[PDB]
């Protein structure tokens, strides 16, 4: 089709026997793709004594492209709740903290 482009707005062509849908786009749904515990960040705990470094849950930084980073910076503004799940990989002999 003759396109009179330049004014933003794309332009399509549509072949013959257009193809039927399936999957329903669904797997591209924003809220859906983002409702899953990602492994983001990783830190070091505090000793009970002394003064702490209050950690801050700001997941709008990106960099290591673990497909969750890009996805958050595909939008401008974002509003969602949060839910966390701390785990704790032992770093030495996993029998030195009896509690």
């Amino acid at each position: 089709v003759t396109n009179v482009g330049e004014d933003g707005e794309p332009g399509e062509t549509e072949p013959r026997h257009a193809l039927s849908p399936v999957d329903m786009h669904v797997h591209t749904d924003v809220s859906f793709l983002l409702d899953r515990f990602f492994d983001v960040e990783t830190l070091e705990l505090s000793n009970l004594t002394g003064s702490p470094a209050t950690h801050v849950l700001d997941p709008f930084g990106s960099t290591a492209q673990l497909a969750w980073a890009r996805l958050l910076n595909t939008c401008t503004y974002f509003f969602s709740d949060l839910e966390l799940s701390i785990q704790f990989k032992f770093t030495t002999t996993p029998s030195s903290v009896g509690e």
Partner: peptide
């Protein structure tokens, strides 16, 4: 001549997957 790519009208992505290496 500019070569602009619009997603087709029957096009869809299925299956999310983590990112491999860079």
């Amino acid at each position: 001549v500019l070569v602009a790519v619009s997603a087709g009208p029957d096009f869809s992505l299925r299956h999310p997957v983590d990112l491999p290496d860079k």
